[PDB]
Amino acid sequence: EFVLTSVGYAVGLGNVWRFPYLCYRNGGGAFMFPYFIMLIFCGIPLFFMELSFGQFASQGCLGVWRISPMFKGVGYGMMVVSTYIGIYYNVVICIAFYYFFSSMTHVLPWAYCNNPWNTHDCAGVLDHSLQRTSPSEEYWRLYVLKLSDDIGNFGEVRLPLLGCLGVSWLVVFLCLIRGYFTATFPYVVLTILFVRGVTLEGAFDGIMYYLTPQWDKILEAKVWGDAASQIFYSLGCAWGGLITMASYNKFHNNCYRDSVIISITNCATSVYAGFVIFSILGFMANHLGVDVSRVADHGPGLAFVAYPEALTLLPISPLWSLLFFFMLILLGLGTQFCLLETLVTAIVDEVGNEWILQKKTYVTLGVAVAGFLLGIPLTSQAGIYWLLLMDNYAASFSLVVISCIMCVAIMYIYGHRNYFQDIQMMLGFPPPLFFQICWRFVSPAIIFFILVFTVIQYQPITYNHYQYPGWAVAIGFLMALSSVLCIPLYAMFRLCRTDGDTLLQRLKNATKPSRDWGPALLEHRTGRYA
Numbered sequence: 001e002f003v004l005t006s007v008g009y010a011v012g013l014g015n016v017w018r019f020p021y022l023c024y025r026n027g028g029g030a031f032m033f034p035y036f037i038m039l040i041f042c043g044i045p046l047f048f049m050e051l052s053f054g055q056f057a058s059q060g061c062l063g064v065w066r067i068s069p070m071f072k073g074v075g076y077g078m079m080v081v082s083t084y085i086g087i088y089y090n091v092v093i094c095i096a097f098y099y100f101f102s103s104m105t106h107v108l109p110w111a112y113c114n115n116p117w118n119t120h121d122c123a124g125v126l127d128h129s130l131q132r133t134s135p136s137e138e139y140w141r142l143y144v145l146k147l148s149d150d151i152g153n154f155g156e157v158r159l160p161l162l163g164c165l166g167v168s169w170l171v172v173f174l175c176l177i178r179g180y181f182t183a184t185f186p187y188v189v190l191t192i193l194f195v196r197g198v199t200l201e202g203a204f205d206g207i208m209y210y211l212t213p214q215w216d217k218i219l220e221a222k223v224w225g226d227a228a229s230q231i232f233y234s235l236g237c238a239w240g241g242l243i244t245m246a247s248y249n250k251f252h253n254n255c256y257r258d259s260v261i262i263s264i265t266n267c268a269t270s271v272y273a274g275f276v277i278f279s280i281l282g283f284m285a286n287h288l289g290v291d292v293s294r295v296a297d298h299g300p301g302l303a304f305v306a307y308p309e310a311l312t313l314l315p316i317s318p319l320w321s322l323l324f325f326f327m328l329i330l331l332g333l334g335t336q337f338c339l340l341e342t343l344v345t346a347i348v349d350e351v352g353n354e355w356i357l358q359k360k361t362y363v364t365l366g367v368a369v370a371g372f373l374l375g376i377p378l379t380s381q382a383g384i385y386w387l388l389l390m391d392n393y394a395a396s397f398s399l400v401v402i403s404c405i406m407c408v409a410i411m412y413i414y415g416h417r418n419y420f421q422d423i424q425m426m427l428g429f430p431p432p433l434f435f436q437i438c439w440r441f442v443s444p445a446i447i448f449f450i451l452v453f454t455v456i457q458y459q460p461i462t463y464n465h466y467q468y469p470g471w472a473v474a475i476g477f478l479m480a481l482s483s484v485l486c487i488p489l490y491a492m493f494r495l496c497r498t499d500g501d502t503l504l505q506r507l508k509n510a511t512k513p514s515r516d517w518g519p520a521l522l523e524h525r526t527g528r529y530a
């Protein structure tokens with residue numbers, strides 16, 4: 001609450017790197033209305049539910065499911081999703097390392113078109129064919145990446161990217177064993193890049209495209225599904241680490257205010273970063289003689305094309321570039337540290353024995369080595385196709401499905417009356433009537449309708465937006481299904497060893513709360529728990 005809401009909880013790579021390119025891909029102004037609609041009704045209530053559920057019983061992601069032991073497969077589905085994110089999230093950081101190390105010059109290498117790697121259609125604003133190209137993304141596409149023409153063309157492994165990835169993983173690991181620039185500063189740099197960028201010629205045309213709604217695309221379930229993914233990704237829902245660090249709070253803590261403040265601050269930061277990004281696109285379209293809708297590419301590297309071009313127009317550009325990329329590195333490292341600490345704690349707690357928890361260093365070393373080896377294919381000539389595949393399939397809508405299943409399990413299996421009496425124990429008042437309504441009828445129905453209309457409107461041979469081959473779509477579907485299949489598969493395991501009779505009483509004996517469910521203190525087990 002105005003202390004940690006700005007040093008973190010709102011600022012990260014999910015606000016300055018993912019939201020701009022998702023918004024640009026999905027239309028720009030046609031993405032804003034579903035974004036706000038699904039923020040108000042479909043993820044402010046769920047953030048509060050997750051925080052209260054974590055804080056009530058002081059348990060992590062696994063072990064909080066004593067409310068209904070049969071549904072423990074929801075906890076394992078968040079570790080599978082977090083494992084996918086933890087692999088490719090540290091490849092975005094190693095790209096920031098590459099730009100940070102390449103800014104230690106007297107002229108920025110992406111400022112002119114006289115470099116040996118530039119084509120004949122380069123066009124800059126400092127110092128023929130069709131569709132003239134800015135110098136900023138030729139550096140990203142022909143020098144940094146050396147992109148190939150297909151996902152099946154592996155090519156050669158890029159040595160500088162591999163070195164930066166190794167450095168990033170070593171830095172992350174060295175802090176797990178032993179252990180300004182947060183709040184204010186991430187906003188000062190953004191304000192500097194925003195004041196310089198609304199004065200340019202053509203910036204207004206990129207702002208109107210960013211805000212003007214398009215009413216012909218509100219009947220598509222794809223846009224609504226993509227808007228739901230970003231809300232849950234940035235807020236941290238269904239990651240698993242939100243419950244773990246909510247369990248350290250005091251019993252009589254006001255998590256309602258914290259949830260509201262954090263949600264609003266995160267939304268404001270995302271929108272402000274979008275304002276910063278979309279002003280540059282208008283200027284690029286103006287001086288390149290193209291339209292704003294087609295000036296750039298709908299890939300995950302929009303932030304590495306627009307941001308370095310803005311820094312080139314500022315006085316003493318290298319000094320600003322160094323600070324910007326150092327800030328990006330720190331922002332990524334904080335989230336990576338949080339995620340890996342949560343994952344290691346969850347792993348050690350489940351396996352816990354006498355040998356384990358005394359060798360926690362070796363588990364941390366094994367996790368870091370395993371995660372470094374899986375990122376090697378993402379540093380080759382076809383590494384951006386794999387990064388886009390794991391960002392659109394592995395963790396896009398599985399988070400929404402898992403959160404919806406958790407909400408349905410808490411309200412309709414445990415009971416809404418019991419949970420409403422539980423919240424009143426922590427706070428002094430019952431939950432607001434708006435939150436009670438947007439917990440039993442609104443959010444589940446909205447998510448259900450989006451999911452149902454996604455598969456009915458499917459099979460157009462068009463929702464495959466990047467023209468991936470046949471096997472890539474199958475691999476993506478396997479990645480997306482490996483996290484939501486942990487929910488029915490664990491239930492089958494639990495139901496095959498629960499003492500009982502034919503499957504009418506075994507269902508009832510497995511969904512009952514455990515004997516040790518409730519507040520985790522003797523002085524707070526008052527009422528229905530004494």
Ligand SMILES: C[C@@H](Oc1ccc(S(C)(=O)=O)cc1C(=O)N1C[C@@H]2C[C@]2(c2cc(C(F)(F)F)on2)C1)C(F)(F)F
Nearest residue numbers: 009012013014233234236239241242245246335338339
């Ligand atoms: C829950 C995940 O956290 C984040 C998820 C996304 C972003 S993003 C897309 O905006 O870059 C930032 C954080 C993040 O770093 N957070 C730090 C701290 C866990 C988080 C948090 C903790 C709480 C609290 F209020 F419960 F304390 O509120 N937010 C969010 C995880 F912990 F697993 F990493």
Ligand SMILES: CC(C)CCC[C@@H](C)[C@H]1CC[C@H]2[C@@H]3CC=C4C[C@@H](O)CC[C@]4(C)[C@H]3CC[C@]12C
Nearest residue numbers: 159160162163164166167169170173368369372
């Ligand atoms: C041990 C876990 C935690 C992380 C692993 C860190 C190791 C594997 C890292 C640390 C620094 C890294 C090296 C740093 C620099 C280079 C130079 C580059 O031209 C080839 C890759 C290479 C040689 C990296 C390969 C892997 C490396 C040795």
Ligand SMILES: CC(C)CCC[C@@H](C)[C@H]1CC[C@H]2[C@@H]3CC=C4C[C@@H](O)CC[C@]4(C)[C@H]3CC[C@]12C
Nearest residue numbers: 392393396397398401454477480481484485487
């Ligand atoms: C088994 C029950 C409990 C859950 C339902 C699983 C199915 C129906 C859901 C869960 C996650 C969903 C997928 C998540 C992400 C994407 C990426 C998008 O580009 C195409 C649709 C696709 C592939 C979704 C289609 C349907 C999906 C596979």
Ligand SMILES: CC(C)CCC[C@@H](C)[C@H]1CC[C@H]2[C@@H]3CC=C4C[C@@H](O)CC[C@]4(C)[C@H]3CC[C@]12C
Nearest residue numbers: 400401404405408412440441444445447448451
């Ligand atoms: C596959 C993913 C999306 C999970 C699907 C579960 C959700 C979306 C479904 C399955 C069971 C359904 C609920 C079953 C019972 C009720 C009670 C009724 O008074 C209001 C509707 C409501 C609340 C339904 C709404 C949608 C629902 C919650």
Ligand SMILES: [Cl-]
Nearest residue numbers: 019230234270
């Ligand atoms: Cl966001």
Ligand code: NA
Nearest residue numbers: 009010234235
């Ligand atoms: Na957050």
Ligand code: NA
Nearest residue numbers: 008012331334
């Ligand atoms: Na952060």
